[PDB]
Design a protein around this nucleic acid. Sequence first.
RNA 1: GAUGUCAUACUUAUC
Lengths: 90, 443, 870, 212, 100, 208, 69
Amino acid sequence: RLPPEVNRILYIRNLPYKITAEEMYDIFGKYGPIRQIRVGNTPETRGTAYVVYEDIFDAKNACDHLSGFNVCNRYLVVLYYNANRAFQKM
Amino acid sequence: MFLYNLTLQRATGISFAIHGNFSGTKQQEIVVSRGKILELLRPDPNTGKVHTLLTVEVFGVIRSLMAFRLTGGTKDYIVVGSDSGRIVILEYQPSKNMFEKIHQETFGKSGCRRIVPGQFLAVDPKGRAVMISAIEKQKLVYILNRDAAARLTISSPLEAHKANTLVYHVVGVDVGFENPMFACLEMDYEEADNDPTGEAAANTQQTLTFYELDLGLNHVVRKYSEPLEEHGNFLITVPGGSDGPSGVLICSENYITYKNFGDQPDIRCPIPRRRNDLDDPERGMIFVCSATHKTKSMFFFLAQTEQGDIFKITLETDEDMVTEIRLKYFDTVPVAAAMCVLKTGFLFVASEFGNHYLYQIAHLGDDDEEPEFSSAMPLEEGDTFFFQPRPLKNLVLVDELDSLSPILFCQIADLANEDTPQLYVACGRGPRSSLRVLRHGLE
Amino acid sequence: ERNRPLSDEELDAMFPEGYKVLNDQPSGNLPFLKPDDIQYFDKLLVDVDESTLSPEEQKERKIMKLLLKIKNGTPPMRKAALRQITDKAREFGAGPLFNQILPLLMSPTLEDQERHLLVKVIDRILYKLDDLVRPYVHKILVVIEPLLIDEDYYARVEGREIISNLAKAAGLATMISTMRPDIDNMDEYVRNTTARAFAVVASALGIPSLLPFLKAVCKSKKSWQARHTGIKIVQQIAILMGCAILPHLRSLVEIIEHGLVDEQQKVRTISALAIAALAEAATPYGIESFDSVLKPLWKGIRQHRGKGLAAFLKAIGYLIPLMDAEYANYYTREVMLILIREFQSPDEEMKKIVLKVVKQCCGTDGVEANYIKTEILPPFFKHFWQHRMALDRRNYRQLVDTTVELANKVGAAEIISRIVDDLKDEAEQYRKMVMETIEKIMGNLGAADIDHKLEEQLIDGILYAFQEQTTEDSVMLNGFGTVVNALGKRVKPYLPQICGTVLWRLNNKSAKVRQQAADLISRTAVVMKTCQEEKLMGHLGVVLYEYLGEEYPEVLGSILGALKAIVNVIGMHKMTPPIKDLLPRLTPILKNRHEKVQENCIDLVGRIADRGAEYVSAREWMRICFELLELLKAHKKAIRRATVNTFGYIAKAIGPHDVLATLLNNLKVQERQNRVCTTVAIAIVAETCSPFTVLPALMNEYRVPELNVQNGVLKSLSFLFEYIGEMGKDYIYAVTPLLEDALMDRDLVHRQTASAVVQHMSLGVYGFGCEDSLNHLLNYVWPNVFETSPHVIQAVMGALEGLRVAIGPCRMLQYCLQGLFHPARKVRDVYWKIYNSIYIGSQDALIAHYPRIYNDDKNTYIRYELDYIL
Amino acid sequence: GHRVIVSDVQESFIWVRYKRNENQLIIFADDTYPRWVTTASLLDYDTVAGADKFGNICVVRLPPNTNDEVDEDRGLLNGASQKAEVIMNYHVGETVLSLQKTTLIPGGSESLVYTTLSGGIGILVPFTSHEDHDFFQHVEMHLRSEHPPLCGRDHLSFRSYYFPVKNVIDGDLCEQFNSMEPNKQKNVSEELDRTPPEVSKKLEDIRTRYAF
Amino acid sequence: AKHHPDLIFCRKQAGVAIGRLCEKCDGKCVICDSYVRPCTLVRICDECNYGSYQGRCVICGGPGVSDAYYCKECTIQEKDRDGCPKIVNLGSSKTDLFYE
Amino acid sequence: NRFTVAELKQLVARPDVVEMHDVTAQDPKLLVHLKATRNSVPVPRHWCFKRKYLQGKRGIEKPPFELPDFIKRTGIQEMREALQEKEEQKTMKSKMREKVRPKMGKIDIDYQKLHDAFFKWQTKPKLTIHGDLYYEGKEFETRLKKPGDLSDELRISLGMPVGPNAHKVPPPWLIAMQRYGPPPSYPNLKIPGLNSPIPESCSFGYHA
Amino acid sequence: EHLQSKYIGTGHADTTKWEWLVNQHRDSYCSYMGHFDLLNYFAIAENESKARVRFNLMEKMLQPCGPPA
RNA sequence: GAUGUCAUACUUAUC
């Protein structure tokens, strides 16, 4: 039993730019094995990242346990990946 | 503009009247309901007059009100129904001098409709249940219980509704330490409205249905249903158990029928009319009240017909069955809505048209020289009972409460050449009509 | 499908630029069909080619094709297929629909969602196919038979609703004729399903409607299987409808008394189960009902042993509170030895029946506490307090209920002295059951009987159960909170020993341990103010002020809840984490995407706006009011109810001049659950502050050329009128031209909002002399009752019900006049519905407002009683 | 004066204008709300107070235009053209059979004395200032919520059974403050910011000035 | 309720059992579903509150927390004098979201 | 079975309320008695149409809102228009920078002025009777005059100054009324200069 | 459907005038028997008492308009 | 104006 809005990929907004890849791998790997993690390296996409997990239940448990996580001095938000919302800039 | 309406003189025409120990002492008290006002009077036997002790405004139309005493208690609670769909059981407090609402059970919508209960309210003589029936296709039965803090509690109301069945009257049969039974004169209007020939409306007379509320099953079902040869107008319950013939007699146009089921036969008795009065060419005469009384020796009923001849009827029965019904013309009384016969020889008649009376019983029974009749007398050719008119000889008038309710005409005039104006109005209906001039001064 | 592994190209194609890495298609646009489901939709892979080769049944293939949109298609496509099959159920017929739905639901490779969609399609096509599925009643009953015995409660409820709809549509004779050969079947599960379906049909169609058929089925002596099925149907009807069975108890008892006398033990056990079930329902306290039944039950319980004796003991324990005090005292004095002898029974069902009967055997007078503590409680502690009883839920809940009944009857101290040794065990389920029993004993009885020699041991056991928790259950924290509430001032040498444990558990590698410590601090926050502990609460608040850096959001929400509980238990302006250094600290915490953490942050912001509004310089509130508009549109229904109260508190504190402009600017968003929340917040701000100051501004949002902004302004005005009520008599003349202009618009939503605002103004200003505006609005709302939308029709019905109570039933009868005998039936039905609503609203008021009707030739209709005058 | 008020037993009361030169009687004013009034009483030149057999009493007020110069075919809705309006309506519970605007006590003010068929006597008095009327309305709204009736029916639904109430203050609910508990009377006085002897004097002064 | 048109009430004889509401539907009315100006409590029937059904929510059906009451718009419109406002059958509401 | 409209008009006492569609109903006499009652309301005209009373004013121009005098006498509408004009010129960066540090005091007009406009300056709207229903063309039909009186627009179109002197204030058609006589359709019409005094009857007409 | 069976006197779209007139007469008789003012006016208009007027009102409840058509 | 496929938008303090 899982809603269809959840997926294997999860987006993160308003992330600190000084965060390293090891801290992001430790924060994403707490709920399960993380398959891939892509951080933005653009001024128009700064503060956002995409973490794709190997399991759907592990990705749902990671998305349920990352909305409003304690980080550096910004308000980061974790949301589900959408095809129509990610390509809104094009 | 914004106006304000106040009440200068209260309503005096009493619609309903009951009697009982509402204060909780050895003396009795009368409770009158004038539709929108509830008053309490104390029939003091020392002076003989009636003195009001409390008067409240119910802000509605009281259709029924009855006082009932619980099992093993001294105070009697008054259960009243109004235009709203809620029955209110209250108790009179002598210390606070007010009517404290003990319980209010809502079981219907507001307005004086035929689906909302509140028209007929019957109570058991033991004080175990209360039946509230509407005009048609609505009935409920509440169970009163005694909580160990000397409290009165109301249970869930039962469902005893029957579709296409109108109810004219309802009463509660006396049952000593048994299940409470409610007897009602029901009338089925399904065949009278489904047949367009018109002949079905002439063979649709009322039938007495007695429903016994089962306390073990927590439901109400119709126990017995017996048809009647005449259309009943009212019902009168007789005390039973360790008393005698428990039953419910039915009154009709020159007819009184004892129809206790089980083993007793239906005993019919015509009402004794006048001797040579030219007042009924082809019309009959029905009863208006019951006024049951018991002085711990026997039981009697002070019935009142449409003319006003108050008759004391006493039923002589056997140890188990009813033998015959006897009646005799006791005295002459004005037309009243309800009579409240209290203890120590007191009879209060609350006339709906005219003044109210409070008399003292001097010669109870009067079975010495009056030509009394009986239901077992082999009389033919109609009723064959011609009673002679006579003045008041068994009761003497003690108190006369002025009740000018029928104030149809009213004019404010100063024809008496005084400072303050006066009001000339009318009172009474028919022969009891009178022109009354009222002033603001004292007598 | 959702857990399938993907390649690198599919992962790179779903990501935008600017990121650094650290035939098989049936007729075109149909969804993908399963390889095992190519049998029911085999006629859809080929082309239709409708040219003199199209029978009617091929259109039934279209009824399969929409089923292809209903099984595994899109949810808008499934909604369109359901709308096409519901509106055309009469034209397609129930025959081919049942013939296409019967092998689809009986497939061995189905799923739960497909079965739920098939049950919803069968229930939705049951309202239009009334009195037509009587030959297809058996084919639907054979598919709905395993749905009632399923594991899920929702599927069982849907099957019971489908069985009730089939019993209401097929009547009583067809259901009795269809279930008549299904009673003497060889399969026991099919016979039990048929008995459950017959019990559901008897519950949905009335007890005397199936009572003589059940009496004839139970009184027939041909086989034991039919009598067992009838007894099982009677037991299911007694267990389904407790209240309904009670009246039928006498009858049901007369049929159940004929059983339990034959040579078959299964029929006697079924009759004993029906009598137990009956006692529970029919004639709950009807000892007389069990009168003629109490005599063979004691003989069967004393002369034989086994499952039948256990069923007779369960029936005696169920009927023992339904008797008098002397009868229960006589029954309890002869059944305690049989209950003590059956304590060593190896069967689980007999042990469960004994544990269920022991709770009812000691529930009143007659049973002494000393004998129950000497000869009943040591065998109940030695035979039932095991590790295998905590595995099953039915064996644990009944044991906890029996322990609570033994603690309420004998004493709480004697149960606390024997239940404290299992609090430090190695099993989680037994420790959770012991903690739940201790919480029930503390809630029902209390902790007054516990002395000083056992309270410290109980506190140590509760601390060992809370510190060694492995699951996410809130039973241990609730038990510790109930124990702290039962202790009160007796836990005064226990607050440092709990604080040193909470401070140690707040710093750990796990994430659930800090959340459990914060939940335990929040549950024990009310016990510190009543024990004169102010420095410890201040130290806990100063620790929790810096404990907001926990990366787990479930721990951060629990820390915010603990901070809110510490701020509620203590003073608002007397906290060592003051409001001057916490309200800017919670301003980045309110932008969380979680549900519970954002709800706790919104509750803390509302509490800080209600009790600490004088701790800011009127600058952070205007910045937090713009962030409060993003806290809505959440699927939790908790933050949206607190954000409106927080906006109303901010408008009451800082003045309703800044939040009203933000609420008007946020009304144009074109999104669901975002415009109604801002309108409700504006209505709450207008009801908390003066409604006149927001009176012209609400007239300004209707001036903008926008439909959504005008609809939101009308909804805000209607909500403000509904929140005001009697205070809307002064704002009726300002809203009367807006309601007159909004009802003349072409959009039906604006007309429905104007009708709702008129209904709110009628229900609020009823009895104040404002009948002129109501009569003016009723002239415009009267053409709005002929709409085709159900929402606009419901709004017009609400406006009519408001105008009949405000302007009077006479004006409602005059407006509905000359419409009951109308030629057009589409208006005559609406006029009859309005007349029925006016009669249900006020029936006695229609007597004086009735028009004069002349008398006919055969019948008379002139009221001669009211026409006479004195 | 130069007009007739024909009271009908079913619909309403209709006004008719009489001419001095001619002898015709053309009706030019009627009411749309059915009342079935039995008796009536004239108070002013425009308004007319009437009482119905159901138990209600209303006051039909004439429009300020009052176009009576009509010489004589359709009207507004199967009637006349100038439809009158109502400004006051109250249900008393009994059928009022007589009504007269007079002065029952010398030195006071004019009031409408009404006699019903139930034996009661009512007195309707207008309000002098708006502050006393607002205080009476606040006292009635406090007494309808703090002191419910014993019959169970609502006080607002009692006068609004057949016809809805409009600018009508029930004096029986306001005069019941002196027969209640002292704590409830003190709470009602604190809610209105006054004293219970001051509230009793304010409730008794209007009754002493309007009637006996 | 007013949101779901497929929801039906019990409409039975209301006894002395007072209705209860859960924490998610606390303060909301039974018919109008409003949380402003409560006027009168709700009276449950005898069949809707018996055994395990005592102290449960009338709208949702879970464990009760607070007392159920009707709004001020239902007491004046004579909506509280009807039968028991208890939701018995749950159709197309909180059933498909649990399986998805 | 179903009678014609002539028999329904001859049998009923009020034949003006009889319609053509009422003859084919289930009760013509009951419908004729209900339609000709005293306080009955007629049925709307949108019951026999096919546009559901909402598809007529599609392309017709309509004003957005008609503000009353009590709402326009507080200065809130001009301040709202100025705020809408100032907010429409702001970009996305100016809207995002105003959310972190907002500028308080948008209009800040008064606090008792709205209460004085809603309590002291309250004006009663123009209501109507309960029998006058609403239709689609009711908002445009405003044509629903007296003999002897002329409006300002008719006097401006005809070029007749209305004055107290009866020399030029009557129209030049009064010479034909003096040469031919009074109109036969109005015997009680009195015009100044022929049958009425000129300085007394300055209204250029009197219906006596 | 169920509204006409539960609450009598409501009506439907196929309700005739005779049944509606009989329901209105039954409602008027119930309002006269319930209200004391109408019963007092009926007793003052005729020479009968309140009990005879109540019996005449209860006896006229069965087909108050006549046979149906 | 109806019909059947697609899209957009709106409402019921729905979750």
